[PDB]
Design a binder for this molecule. Structure first.
Ligand SMILES: [Mg+2]
Ligand SMILES: [Zn+2]
Ligand SMILES: [Zn+2]
Ligand SMILES: [Zn+2]
Lengths: 133, 45, 86, 160, 196, 559, 114, 49, 65, 264, 141, 102
RNA sequence: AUCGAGAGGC
């Protein structure tokens, strides 16, 4: 029920596409020049500028009918700025010992490549995305 | 009432008569005519 | 002609109940039941003759036999019991 | 025509070829001409194909022409329907049209005939030839107000 | 119908509170579907809304005569001079909720015509009404409490479905069923039959 | 053909139609008048006598009532005029002619009856007003329209007849038609335009609207789906909320042009177990299309679930639409000054090409290409030039159409509209034609008395460079009308010719039935086909799938 | 000819209870109230007020047919919270805000001249 | 605003509809069909005024 | 055939404004836009009731019976 | 003043009232205007008994025109719905009877206004049933026109009702209703050709709220709680009473729900 | 006075008609882009001029506003339907005893008028009303 | 039995191309139980997909052809309704006799 | 009853 991935990416290219409140962001890992990702981001809620540095995280938890946060009684599992929920729909074997995971947050897509997360990411409905400032 | 008083019949019976003809300019309304059967045979001045 | 019957072992017609013979069967039963005729199932609070016949079918309590006619005049009798529904 | 053909590798590739289109038809003579492929020549005058290549080639020419007329408007209809039509036109000796001259002079009972065209003349011909209607046709049973041998009445039901 | 072949019937009657409303409080007498516009290319209707809007505001007439030098640009210039959006759009709020409509709406006066085809003049329903004399079939027409024709075009459809019993029912019990007596030697209804 | 092959019938009804978004597919809105007028014979039984007594007491003047009682003797008892209409003692084995009530099966028809799908059984829903009401997605088989159309209704009178209506002729059974081996009903003009806007990646819904959308789905599980966005504000996506209408256990897989599994343009469709992953929903996905959602649900889940899915998706999308709004207006016919400048530049360059080819012909410098005269070559070149010009201006306009343009929106969703419509309304309506050629010389060597003789100009023979937006000139108006009259005639004639043709086909193949031995025979039993469709399948439940052996290199085949 | 008398929009008839209450299925602590002879004037206000009580989990309404003046309001509340009480609190708070509005408006109007 | 131009027969107002016909006493030439034994024709409808 | 009581759309009583309007055009020689503006008919839903009205009753009165 | 919704009146007149609502959620303002239109009760003619009619109009034409006439409805709360009163058909506590009788005496055209309506029934001392007359000349609405020799003699019975039953029973004059002129909420998507700013005109209400900064990000958690309204009345009820009675009618409508809840 | 002539179909074969009197003006650039594209006449041997081209239409089509903006079959359909619209067919309707008569309560003259209407007496005997029309998707009824 | 082998000949080709031994295990990853379930589903859907005797397929075909022709609408060959009437009514004197030579 | 005409949808 704990974290399944953690890394820091620096933004390379933001592209609004034909959209008005969503941009397709393309970034790569920092201090690790082999693993990159692509994501769809609501810029209206949490803006995203070029060459920013965003702390990315994936969790398996923290089925049941969602209920609004009643009060501060609910202890958040996040001091981040941006959180989404998605579902894994493809695990692409890029090459020998190089894998890619495909996520969709109700339409907003995510593509992540590299092979230092093999033991954690899974073909599981549960997937929480988290971005920090 | 006005339209009925300027109406022509053509009892010959076949699309060559039914078509709007060049000579109809200024003499017959181009668009006003019944639809379906007997279209283009019945015209208005 | 004379007794154009068919042995039950040598039958090649489709063992499945065609939608047409099913609708005819259900109609005839719902008709029988529209009139005060006996029902051969525990109607669990069902009143519509059609629902009664439809549930009489799943429990195969409908004692009727189809007579599938062949073009030469021959025919095959098929009890509702052995017929399949899918 | 930019026709497709198997490459020696096996993959299909487009191999354009020059084709001749006439403005007239005498199939018998043109078929026996050198320089052509007497196995690929084609005519839209399918009745000539019935005369030359037999009725069975006329079946395929008929289906191809109807396919063209339907798919011209971007429409599509499943094979079986057009096929049924073509076979009914063909299942006789040669070509039977969908008109009073064709199928309606068959032996298809008598009441079925009088329900399309030439009603009273067909009735009279039946009065003369002492015709006997089988009463198995659709329109025969409809005219008589009986349950016709249709999907629901294509059989009998009895007791177990 | 409008003046551009945009014929149409009423599907619903909405009271004014249930009607979408503009900030001026104005409300449509009529609501038509956009999907009737582009396939017919009846642009004159669109121009008519614009011109009639400008006229009602200005207290002048709409020179909708053909073969004129009236352009949509001049009309829009007048309309903007009168404080409305140039192309005829208007912010409209939902009637039930009161939350704004994301889409701004095309909205304006348009000449409409009430046609001679009204429902209660065309509604018809018959269950075992009067029969004809010669055929002993139902009579023709709603003014005589007649029956709808079950034509052969529909007999064909019933055949395609496979419903033999419904077909016979429509064709015998519902129209002109009858029972006759025939001789088993001469197959003709020349049999004299006393039932009493 | 008028008293035997067809006949006027009792228990018939007929009136105007109009659409109801809040009716299930197989339902039909029956006016209370017709329900009071049409009767069904119900024989009394211990299961119904309690309900039939109440019906008889309620009398024929108000619904649910009844009109006549039939005794075992066989005498009719008229409830309108009878002293004993109050103290009735129904006896077992009697018949009550009750009113048409809710959920009765009725045969529903629209002329012309070209299809088996034109006469479909419906569930009665008695409604107040005077119009017949039906779900929009049942229009396509009937080719109905709510512009004054009329529809007929027929009431079964026997139990097996009700059975045949409900189990063979029902609406959900005819969703997949044998003709064209594909569904004949789909999502239409309002739901179709709306569902796209709903399913845009840019479309985000807040809590309040989301819960109403959830409730609006009738067979709903009562489990709030987790929102797609959580941290800054709990947000849902149109895809997410719509997926509640999609039954679990469904997979739909379709790739458009340039469709990576990342799908940057959000095209294609990937729906995994009752939830959609990526893809903007439009006509290809949810239309009456081969291999669409309706095909999948009808084959996998069944007819009834597909029918309920119709209602659910309609209710959700219509609710969203009603609060989001959509209007067309005139603003969607204006291209900017630059675009119109390029368009008139295109028209002038085509005019110059025509002028040049004309003078070339005037100097007897044509290359007499084989098989055709010089005049034919000339006319074909000018017609080609002018059509290329029309399509170039149209594409010039369509490029400039913004993504908010409502005409472009209806085009994109596939609800209504085409490229040519945009081109004519905004760029150029094009060249008119009569009997194939351009506008002919009705007068002596001229088209109109405002032209010098022997003028083969673009506009002299019917080229309308003005757009419907810009406005046509008198001559252009006259030529346009001249052309459109030919179309009115073509319709008014092909209608009759096709009615005759259809009737002939029907009367020629009427007796062809797949017998029990899979032979396709006739009244005489003469074999037409030995296996129906040459494979013995029903035309329904037949889908387009690829054969992977054909095609591809022998190398890839081996690998 | 077939139109219903318009007073049927607000006049209950023949034992039409104003409110019917049904326990929801496949949902614990959930209940659906059929309001009779009401429209979007009432249901929207009740739902938007229920959406303010933090102990309310599910709050929505629907008008299944504009022909009829009636609607359904479904409420799901926290454990130990009868939804009828959440409805009561919502209604009473609405009435309190409305009275406050009336008093403030009367104040400003009597302050106003002309 | 009544415009006239109608009759009143047995109470019902009647209108005579203009009947169209090609004028007589004018000469016109018509080609003939491809399988026709004759090539061309010149016809005139001789009508006494 | 006579001045409607109130505007169909909004409901503002306009039937009490016919004769006044006709004087505002005749006595004061105003124009239709300003005559409608003077009578407090500011929304066009109201204006189109007075501007597009054809008072046919003046023809019906001429019939003596 | 009092905790909750705040009202600030911008302009007040006998005929309309332009004001501002603060600290109110939307659905309340919406339901308020809905009740202001439909569910507030007044008095207007709901039966017409005609005796002689020689006019160029049909009887139903005139009956319709009459029903639409504004009548004073201040003390309408002291009048009861005739459906609730115990009289045979109508009484003096449930109905007000007007009479109308005019004759074409003059050779000139004779007009028939609303001022010619005569209150016959017993008023029992309440401000009820007097036709509303805002005309500068003093006449009413032009009900009909009479030639010399035509007469019209009828009797109108006016009862209580709400605009749901028929639109004649409304103070229903248009109600202006705007919120968030700058669209800071992002509640509508603006259609444009070149610039949404220059092509869309600014509302008068753009003054009473301060503009947003192009550099400021989208305020996502903000909701709309500040509304601009303008309520206009035909005159059957003064404006202040239109909005107050709408408020009270809505509150009363909620009350019945509590009463049914206790009855359960 | 010999300023106007009666021209039938046969005679007009031998003349050259101008569409507008502006065609007779001498010519010797910067134009409104929104106006329709009018070709230069390219002819000079005129003998006539149309009184006004809109006079090619009938009594029904002369009601259609901006019929030069509509696909022609729509202009035909409206001509066929304007003969089914209700309104005051005659001011003496209260005297005539016709088998059927439908009369609009409150007819209104259109806000957009053809110049031809003045001679068709449409603004005096209208047949419809200036309804406030909104084009919108709203509950899909 | 030969008629049966002939009537299914095309389907079985797709079947084998789809259930190829290397395909079932490298492209698909079917377990044993999943494979037998695939078999059961195919046989069931097939046996359901057979035409039901009593089907009046003649009328169905005639409609299936006539109705799409009613929408048949408007480079040298006769097409549409004229060509269709040339086809059904066997037209000896066709308008556009052509001959395509390869 | 017969017949004529006009109109409605595709
Ligand atoms: Mg229609
Ligand atoms: Zn005998
Ligand atoms: Zn108004
Ligand atoms: Zn009383």
């Amino acid at each position: 029920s704990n974290t399944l991935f953690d890394d820091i990416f620096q933004v390379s290219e933001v592209d609004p596409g034909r959209y008005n409140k969503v941009c397709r962001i393309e970034a790569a890992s920092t201090t690790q020049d082999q693993c990159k990702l692509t994501l769809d981001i609501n810029v209206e809620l949490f803006p995203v500028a070029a060459q920013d540095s965003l702390t990315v995280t994936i969790a398996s938890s923290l089925t049941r009918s969602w209920r609004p946060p009643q009060a501060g009684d609910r202890s958040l599992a996040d001091d981040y700025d941006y959180v989404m929920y998605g579902t894994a729909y493809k695990f692409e074997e890029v090459s020998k010992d190089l894998i890619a995971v495909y996520y969709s947050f109700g339409g907003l897509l995510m593509r992540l490549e590299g092979n230092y997360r093999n033991l954690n990411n899974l073909k599981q409905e549960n997937a929480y995305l988290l971005i920090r400032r | 009432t006005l339209s009925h008083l300027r109406r022509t019949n053509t009892p010959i019976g076949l699309a060559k008569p039914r078509q709007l003809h060049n000579t109809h300019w200024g003499l017959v309304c181009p668009a006003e005519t019944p639809e379906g059967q007997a279209c283009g045979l019945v015209k208005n001045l | 002609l004379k007794e154009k019957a068919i042995p039950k072992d040598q039958r090649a017609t489709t063992p499945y109940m065609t939608k047409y013979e099913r609708a005819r069967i259900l109609g005839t039963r719902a008709l029988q039941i529209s009139m005060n005729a006996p029902v051969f199932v525990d109607l669990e609070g069902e009143t519509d003759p059609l629902r009664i016949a439809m549930k009489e079918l799943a429990e195969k309590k409908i004692p009727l036999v189809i007579r599938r006619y062949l073009p030469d005049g021959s025919f095959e009798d098929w009890s509702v019991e052995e017929l399949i529904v899918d | 025509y930019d026709r497709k053909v198997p490459s020696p590798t096996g993959e299909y590739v487009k191999e354009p070829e020059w084709v001749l289109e006439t403005d007239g038809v005498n199939l018998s003579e043109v078929m026996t001409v050198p320089g052509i492929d007497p196995t690929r020549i084609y005519t839209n005058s399918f009745i000539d194909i019935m005369e030359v290549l037999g009725i069975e080639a006329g079946r395929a020419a008929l289906y191809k022409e109807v396919y063209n007329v339907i798919a011209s408007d971007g429409s599509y209809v499943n094979y079986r329907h057009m096929a049924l039509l073509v076979d009914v036109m063909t299942t006789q000796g040669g070509l039977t049209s969908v008109t009073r001259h064709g199928f309606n002079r068959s032996n298809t009972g008598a009441l079925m005939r009088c329900s399309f065209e030439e009603t009273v003349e067909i009735l009279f011909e039946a009065g003369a030839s002492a015709e006997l209607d089988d009463c198995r046709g659709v329109s025969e049973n409809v005219i008589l107000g009986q349950m016709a041998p249709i999907g629901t009445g294509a059989f009998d039901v009895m007791i177990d | 119908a409008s003046r551009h072949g945009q014929k149409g019937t009423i599907g619903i009657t909405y009271r004014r509170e249930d009607m979408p409303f503009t900030a001026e409080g104005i409300v449509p007498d009529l609501i038509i579907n956009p999907h009737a516009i582009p396939s017919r290319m009846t642009v004159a209707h669109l121009i008519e809304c614009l011109l009639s809007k400008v006229a009602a505001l200005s207290g002048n007439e709409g020179d909708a005569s053909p073969f004129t030098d009236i352009t949509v640009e001049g009309i829009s210039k007048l309309l903007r001079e009168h404080g409305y959006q140039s192309r005829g759009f208007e912010v409209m709020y939902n009637g039930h909720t009161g939350k704004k409509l994301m889409a701004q709406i095309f909205f304006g006066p348009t000449y409409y015509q009430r046609l001679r085809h009204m429902v209660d003049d065309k509604i018809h329903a018959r269950a075992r009404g009067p029969m004809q004399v010669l055929t002993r079939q139902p009579v023709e027409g709603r003014s005589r409490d007649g029956g709808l024709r079950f034509g052969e075009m529909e007999r064909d459809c019933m055949i395609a479905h496979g419903a033999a019993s419904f077909l016979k029912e429509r064709l015998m019990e519902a129209s002109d069923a009858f029972r006759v007596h025939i001789c088993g030697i001469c197959g003709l209804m020349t049999v004299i039959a006393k039932l009493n | 053909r008028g008293n035997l092959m067809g006949k006027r019938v009792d228990f018939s009804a007929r009136t105007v139609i109009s659409g109801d978004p809040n009716l299930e597919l197989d339902q039909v809105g029956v006016p209370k008048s017709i329900a009071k007028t049409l009767t069904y014979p119900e024989v009394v039984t211990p299961y119904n006598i309690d309900r039939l007594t109440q019906l008889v007491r309620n009398g024929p003047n108000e619904h649910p009532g009844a009109k006549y009682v039939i005794r075992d003797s066989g005498d009719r008892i008229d409830l309108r005029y009878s002293k004993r209409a109050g103290d009735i003692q129904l006896q077992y084995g009697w018949k009550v002619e009750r009113h048409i009530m809710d959920n009765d099966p009725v045969l529903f028809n629209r002329q012309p009856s070209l299809h088996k799908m034109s006469m479909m059984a419906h569930r009665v829903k008695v409604i107040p007003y005077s119009t017949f009401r039906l779900n929009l997605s049942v229009t396509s088989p009937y080719n109905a329209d709510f512009d004054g159309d009329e529809m007929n209704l027929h009431v079964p009178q026997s139990e097996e007849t009700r059975a045949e209506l409900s189990q063979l002729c029902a609406v959900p059974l005819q969703i997949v038609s044998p003709q064209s081996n594909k569904p004949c009903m789909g999502i239409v003009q309002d739901t179709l335009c709306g569902i796209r806007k709903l399913t845009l990646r840019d479309t985000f819904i807040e809590l309040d609207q989301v819960l109403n959308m959830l409730y609006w789905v009738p067979d709903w599980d009562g489990v709030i789906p987790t929102p797609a966005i959580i941290k800054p504000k709990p947000l849902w996506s149109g895809k997410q909320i719509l997926s509640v209408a999609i039954p679990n256990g469904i997979h739909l897989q379709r790739f458009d042009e340039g469709t990576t599994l990342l799908s940057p343009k959000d095209n294609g469709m990937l729906i995994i177990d009752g939830q959609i992953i990526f893809g903007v929903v439009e006509k290809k996905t949810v239309g009456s299309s081969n291999g669409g959602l309706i095909h999948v649900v009808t084959r996998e889940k069944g007819p009834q679930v597909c029918a309920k899915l119709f209602g659910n998706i309609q209710k959700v999308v219509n609710f969203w639409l009603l609060h989001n709004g959509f209007s067309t207006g005139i603003g969607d016919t204006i291209a900017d000054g630059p675009t119109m400048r390029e368009i008139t530049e295109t028209i002038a360059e085509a005019k110059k090409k025509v002028l040049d080819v004309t003078k070339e012909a005037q100097a007897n410098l044509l290359t007499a290409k084989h098989g055709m005269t010089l005049r034919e070559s000339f006319e074909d070149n000018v017609v080609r030039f002018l059509n290329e010009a029309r399509d170039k201006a149209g594409r010039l306009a369509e490029v400039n159409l913004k993504d908010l343009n409502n005409v472009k929106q209806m085009v994109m969703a596939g609800s209504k509209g085409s490229f040519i419509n945009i081109a004519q309304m905004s760029a150029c309506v094009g060249q008119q034609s009569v009997e194939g050629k351009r506008i002919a010389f009705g007068f002596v060597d001229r088209t109109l008395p405002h032209f010098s003789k022997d003028d083969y100009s673009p506009e002299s023979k019917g080229f309308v460079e003005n757009s419907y937006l810009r406005g046509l000139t008198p001559q252009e108006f006259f030529f346009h009308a001249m052309g459109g009259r030919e179309g009115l005639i073509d319709t008014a004639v092909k209608t009759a010719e096709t009615g005759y043709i259809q009737r002939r086909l029907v009367k020629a193949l009427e007796d062809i039935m797949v017998h029990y031995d899979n032979t396709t025979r006739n009244s005489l039993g003469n074999v037409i086909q030995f296996i129906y469709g040459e494979d013995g399948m029903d035309a329904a439940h037949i889908e387009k799938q690829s054969l992977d052996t054909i095609g591809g290199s022998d190398a890839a085949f081996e690998k | 000819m077939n139109a219903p008398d318009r007073f049927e929009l607000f006049l209950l008839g023949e034992g039409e209870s104003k409110l019917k209450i049904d326990p929801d299925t496949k949902a614990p602590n959930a209940v659906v109230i059929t309001f009779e002879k009401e429209d979007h004037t009432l249901g929207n206000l009740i739902r938007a007020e229920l959406l303010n009580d933090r102990k309310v989990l599910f709050a929505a309404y629907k008008v299944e047919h504009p022909f009829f003046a009636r609607f359904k309001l479904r409420i799901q509340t926290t454990e130990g919270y009868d939804p009828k009480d959440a409805l009561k609190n919502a209604c009473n708070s609405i009435i309190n805000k409305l009275g406050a509005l009336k008093t403030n408006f009367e104040t400003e109007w009597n302050l106003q001249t002309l | 605003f009544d415009m006239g131009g109608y009759f009143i027969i047995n109470g019902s107002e009647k209108v005579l509809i203009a009947q169209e016909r090609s004028a007589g006493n004018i000469v016109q030439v018509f080609k003939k069909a491809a399988p026709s034994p004759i090539s061309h024709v010149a016809e005139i409808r001789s009508a006494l005024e | 055939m006579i001045v409607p009581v109130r505007c169909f759309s909004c409901g503002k009583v306009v039937g009490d404004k016919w004769e006044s309007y006709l004087n505002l055009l005749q006595e004061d020689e105003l124009d239709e836009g300003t005559a409608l503006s003077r009578l407090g008919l500011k929304r066009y839903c109201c204006r189109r009731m007075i501007l597009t009205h054809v008072d046919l009753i003046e023809k019906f009165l001429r019939y003596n019976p | 003043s009092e905790e909750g919704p705040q009202v600030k009146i911008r302009e007040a007149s006998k005929d309309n009232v332009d004001f501002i609502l603060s600290n109110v959620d939307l659905a309340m303002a919406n339901s308020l205007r809905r009740v202001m239109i439909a569910e507030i009760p007044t008095l207007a003619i709901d039966s017409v008994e005609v005796e002689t009619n020689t006019t160029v109009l049909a009887d139903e034409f005139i009956a319709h025109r009459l029903g639409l006439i504004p009548l004073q409805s201040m003390d309408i709360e002291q009048l009861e719905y005739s459906r609730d009163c115990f009289c045979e058909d109508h009484c003096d506590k449930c109905s007000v009877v007007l009479t109308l009788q005019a004759f074409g005496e003059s050779e000139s055209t004779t007009n028939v206004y609303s001022k010619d309506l005569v209150i016959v029934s017993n008023l029992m001392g309440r401000n009820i049933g007097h036709p509303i007359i805002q005309d500068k000349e003093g006449n009413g609405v032009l009900i009909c026109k009479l030639r010399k020799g035509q007469e019209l003699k009828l009797t109108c019975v006016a009862k209580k009702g709400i605009a749901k039953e028929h639109a004649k029973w409304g103070p229903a004059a248009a109600i202006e209703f705007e919120y968030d002129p700058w669209n800071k909420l992002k509640h509508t998507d603006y259609w444009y050709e070149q610039d949404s700013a220059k092509e869309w005109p600014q509302s008068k209400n753009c003054e009473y709220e301060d503009p947003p900064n192009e550099g400021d990000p989208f305020d996502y958690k903000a909701q709309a709680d500040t509304f601009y309204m303008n309520v206009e009345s035909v005159g059957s009820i003064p404006v202040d009473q239109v909005v107050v009675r709408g408020i009270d009618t809505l509150q009363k409508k909620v009350a019945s729900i509590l009463l049914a809840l206790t009855q359960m | 006075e010999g300023l106007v002539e009666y021209i039938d179909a046969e005679e007009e074969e031998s003349i050259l008609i101008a569409m507008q009197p502006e065609d007779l003006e001498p010519a010797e650039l910067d134009v409104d882009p929104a106006k329709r594209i009018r070709v230069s006449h390219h002819a000079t041997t005129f003998t006539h001029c149309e009184i006004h081209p809109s006079m090619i239409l009938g009594v029904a089509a002369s009601i259609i506003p901006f019929p030069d903006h509509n696909q022609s079959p729509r202009n035909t359909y409206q001509s066929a339907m304007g003969k089914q619209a209700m309104g005051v067919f005659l001011t003496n309707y209260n005297v005539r005893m016709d088998t059927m008569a439908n009369i609009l309560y409150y007819p209104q003259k259109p806000l957009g008028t053809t110049r031809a209407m003045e001679y068709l007496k449409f603004r005096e005997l209208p047949a419809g009303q200036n309804a406030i029309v909104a084009i919108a998707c709203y509950s899909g009824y | 039995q030969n008629a049966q082998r002939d009537a299914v000949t095309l389907f079985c080709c797709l079947l084998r191309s789809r259930l190829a031994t290397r395909r079932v295990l490298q492209e698909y990853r079917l377990t044993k139980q999943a494979f037998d379930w695939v078999l059961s589903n195919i046989e069931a859907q097939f046996l359901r997909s057979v035409v039901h005797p009593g089907e009046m397929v003649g009328v169905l075909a005639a409609q299936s052809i006539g109705e799409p022709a009613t929408q048949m609408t408007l480079k040298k060959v006769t097409s549409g309704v004229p060509r269709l009437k040339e086809i059904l009514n066997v037209a000896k004197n066709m308008k556009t006799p052509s001959l395509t030579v390869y």
